[PDB]
Design a protein around this ligand. Structure first.
Ligand SMILES: CC1(C)SCN(C(=O)[C@@H](O)[C@H](Cc2ccccc2)NC(=O)COc2c(Cl)cccc2Cl)[C@@H]1C(=O)N[C@H]1c2ccccc2C[C@H]1O
Ligand SMILES: [Cl-]
Ligand SMILES: [Cl-]
Ligand SMILES: [Cl-]
Ligand SMILES: [Cl-]
Lengths: 99, 99
């Protein structure tokens, strides 16, 4: 699909059996989701942006459904104010910026 | 151009006759640039990112070139970790997301 940027590029995602709203974010290296349970192992990580840094849990090899497109990758879980789909998963669904 | 997301979508911008690197950032509502001199009056703005909120200076109707594309709009100036081109100017240069 072609998504215009008049409003926030929000999409419905399926992660860990849960439906969530998430922002397609080209400024984010990684994907970060609000507090939730994910299976398997994790390690602590710090991610930085505007306002500074937050502590997240890093889960690797996680499957997510984005607009019907399944993708696998690392997902960070923590106190993000917005669910964000970052470049690590945006690449996997074939998402580009066009102008 | 078509910009893939395997690396950061970093572009050259021109503001005040100066070349700068900036990030095409679909997750940002607004355009935020690191400390610099801009003409005219500013007004207060608080913007919320991953690590919280920062105060910025809002300058309206600023002439800015982005990857050779001419835009005129609002530029926020403050303690941003990187120059970011948000949706306010991405829409001006006709930028969309495609997959
Ligand atoms: C470093 C940056 C270029 S600065 C802005 N940024 C980004 O990814 C931005 O798109 C960011 C995303 C976001 C949206 C809503 C709430 C909070 C955060 N937005 C912002 O920082 C601020 O955006 C706004 C403005 Cl400018 C005005 C009004 C309202 C808003 Cl939400 C990058 C970043 O934080 N990236 C980090 C990030 C974020 C999420 C997941 C992983 C990572 C790694 C790291 O790369
Ligand atoms: Cl900051
Ligand atoms: Cl990954
Ligand atoms: Cl590709
Ligand atoms: Cl504007």
């Amino acid at each position: 699909p072609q998504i215009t940027l008049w409003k926030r590029p929000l999409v419905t995602i399926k992660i860990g059996g849960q439906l969530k709203e998430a922002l397609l974010d080209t400024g984010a290296d990684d994907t970060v989701i609000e507090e939730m349970s994910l299976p398997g192992r994790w390690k602590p990580k710090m991610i930085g942006g505007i306002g500074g840094f937050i502590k997240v849990r890093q889960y690797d090899q996680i499957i997510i459904e984005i607009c019907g497109h399944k993708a696998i990758g690392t997902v960070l879980v923590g106190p993000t104010p917005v669910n964000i789909i970052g470049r690590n998963l945006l690449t996997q669904i074939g998402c580009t910026l066009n102008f």
